[PDB]
Amino acid sequence: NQIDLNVTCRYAGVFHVEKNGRYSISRTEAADLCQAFNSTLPTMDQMKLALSKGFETCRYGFIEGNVVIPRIHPNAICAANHTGVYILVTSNTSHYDTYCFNASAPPEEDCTSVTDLPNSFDGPVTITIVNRDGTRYSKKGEYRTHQEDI
Ligand SMILES: Cc1cccc(N2CCN[C@@H](C)C2)n1
């Protein structure tokens, strides 16, 4: 019973979380997942400020109100070569990665590793935070509050 959470650098508190190496997070799960990091889904303004500090990914993820990809450098296979916060407009499907926002993180680029999941609750899952540098933090718990996400 294991969940891998790949996480990034934070940029003005905003970071990306990919679950189990595939688009697998629902909007309800995303809010619960960010809550386990004492975080919330970023607002569009928070995400735009993170972008300005150096944040970009090549993956769709929830923010408050939309599913987006922050892009700095145009890449044909990431958000159809767009720059800025690219907003997904048309999709059949509901599961993506998520972004999270931690107000207590540093104001600009923070590329230290994540070493805690501070607000997970008691539960049976081995949750492993996987940093981009491969360092890992694991803890037994749960963060999903909606049965349909389990
Ligand atoms: C990955 C990285 C490393 C150092 C700086 C940086 N940014 C500075 C602010 N603006 C961004 C376009 C780029 N991004």
Cβ pair 32, 144 in contact under 8 A = yes
Q: Which helix (H) or strand (E) holds 48?
A: helix 44-52
How many angstroms is it from 30 CA to the middle of ligand 1? 26
**Amino acid in the structure at residue 112:** T
Domain with 128, as residue range(s), is 1-150
- Whether 123 lines ligand 1, by a CB cut-off of 6 Å, is no
CB 105 within 8 A of CB 46: no
Structure tokens given for 93: 């499907």
* φ/ψ of residue 42, rounded to 5: -65, 150
Binding residues: 22, 59-60, 86
Please give the tally of structural domains in the chain: 1
Rounded Cα gap, residues 125 and 34, in angstroms? 17
SS3 for 24?
coil
| Residue list, annotated binding site for hyaluronan | 22, 59-60, 86
- In this structure, what token pair is assigned to residue 141? 């718990």
Whole-number Å distance, alpha carbon 144 to ligand 1 midpoint, is: 33
Q: How was this structure determined?
A: X-ray
Q: Which of 49, 53, 132 for mutating ligand 1's site (highest number of atoms within 8 Å of CB)?
A: 53
- Both tokens assigned to 23: 């688009």
Asked if 6 and 130 count as a contact pair (C-beta separation under 8 A), the reply is yes
Does the beta carbon of 84 lie inside 6 Å of ligand 1? no
The answer, yes or no, to whether any atom of ligand 1 lies below 6 A from the CB of 54, is yes
